[PDB]
Amino acid sequence: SSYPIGAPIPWPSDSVPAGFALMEGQTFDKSAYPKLAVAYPSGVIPDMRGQTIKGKPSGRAVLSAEADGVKAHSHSASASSTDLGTKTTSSFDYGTKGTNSTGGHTHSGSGSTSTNGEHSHYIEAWNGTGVGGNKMSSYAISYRAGGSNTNAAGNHSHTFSFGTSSAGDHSHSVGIGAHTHTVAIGSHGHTITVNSTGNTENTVKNIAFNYIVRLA
Template sequence: MSQVAITKAFQDWKAQQAIDNTPVTLDEFVFAYIPGLDITKPVDVTEALPAADKIVHRQEVSKTGVINDNAVIYSVTIGADVGDFDFNWIGLVNSESSVLAMVIHVPTQRKIKNAAGQQGNVLVRSMMMEYTGAKAATAITTPAETWQIDFTARLAGIDDRKRLENVDLYGDAAFFGDGWLVARQDEQYFVTQGAGYVAGLRADLPENVDIEVSAPAKVWLDVCWTGTLTSVWSVQCKITVADELGNYQQNGQPHYVYAVASIDEDGSITDLRPKGLNDDLGLGELASMGVDDVLPVGIPQPWPTDTPPEKWALMWGQAFDKSVYPLLGAAYPSGIIPDMRSQTIKGKPASGREVLSFELDGNKAHIHLASAASTDLGTKSTSAFDYGTKTTNAAGKHSHTFTGPNSMTVKDGDKNSAVSTRGTMTTNEAGEHSHTVVIGTHAHTVEIGKHAHDITIEESGNVENTVKNIAYNYIVRLA
């Protein structure tokens, strides 16, 4: 809330100007930043200009205008070529005398200058001074409506148009992931940090918030688009626990509510947060889905480097802490991430094999048949060749000894007498001799017959079964 005051110094100076019959001219705005300035306290009418080191910008009055005989307005436009600075103090002065006429204490605001990669802002600040005879004292004659344009209605219309466009996209409400999820730990209920939309207004909860619940009841998210004419507008959010609650107006601002959870008498929680968008928009549904909806924890994903992205891990068979990553622990109860190096994924067979069980590589059982063609070669003859007449070696020199009767005639004078005896006798020796053998032209017949040969098939192939492939790492999300 801003604080405004016309200073005593101005009142004294204005009186002197009237005596001197000189117009009351206020021609300069002064902007300053006062550390520790309490904008909830009224402005001291004796306040003076801040010290020079606190003044961040000075600029001539851009426009003046008369509202009525007793009210005039001064305005300044600070272009996007000015900045950067913060300010929480604005003063209207007469530059010639340095008389401070009017002071405003405001919430700290930022003036940004156009720069590379930075869009500057344009600020318009106006001060209306109301006192008796203001029009005559200042000699201002230009009606303010000729240059003072009230953009309030137009800006409000732009804001509401954007809100309604979000309603077309997100419906009455939509939430991302666990944003604004009501949960309980022991006996304490809390609302989970995250984001969502209610009535087209984006509601962000930076951290978990504990709530008190008297069951049965519903937990409502209450959102409001609010701000001041000179401040940044934003969505204000609060949690209300009530049986029923409807949209309402407060301080001229509409509040939109949505029940995010219902809590039964026994303390059980029913999540009422819609997570889809307007079904008519098709792909728009994806915009409100959390990562757990699109990619549940535990699904292996191919990744092209050895460095996983943040909150992901390589699947190399390592252990993990299930208390730190409970969702991953639900997917892998052993607390060990499967080692997917050199592995492929196979759908679970109907044979009853366990999920996540390992199987070695192998070929399907089969046999090989092999044979050589069987051919009856019949009876074949060798080639005919005439070896002619050949002579054996010379040998066989020998004699024979035998026992038998010996007969001889003994002559005694002219008388012959025959004598017969027995003894051993030897034949005359036969000499060495050889034989001549005629071989002649001849051939041999060979029977081959039907037969077969054994065949050995040589080993071939890789060390393991594989297909054409590109090596990726498998990664899994940590949560």
């Protein structure tokens, strides 16, 4: 025969011709169909529904099934740059600080006192002839007759004591200035999830036929 019994035939109609059967995985009687049994010694006609025919390679058995499966491949990919913006730090408060204690000191001073001390002294007078010497006599006093000086006397000093007026009230400036800090951010990553793409089946362009087989 030009097309041997048992070879699958692609049939374009749901009306199956007399003498043929749909290939649907069914058993048959090997005694009743001796030529079909040459093609299928198991006595089972393969289920061809949803199947494509592939020429048997080395490493695969005849009538073995193979699932659909996508070929190994990957993808290039990239992530958008993200700007994290500006952040504000916690507040630090230096409060109020004290200075060291300093400023103990003395002053010096000099001057003149006021002018004072004007005075006179009393002198005992004596009279009566017979005795002379030493004492002031007032024997003859009718008219002025000039005058004269005591000897010198009266060198002296005084002590002084004082508290001063209150002074010295003051303040200072202190230049503090400006500063910055650094902040180490360190390292980080993210978890990447790639979503599914595709159909329930892997397919190529195909037209549907009913696989049939000649019984005898």
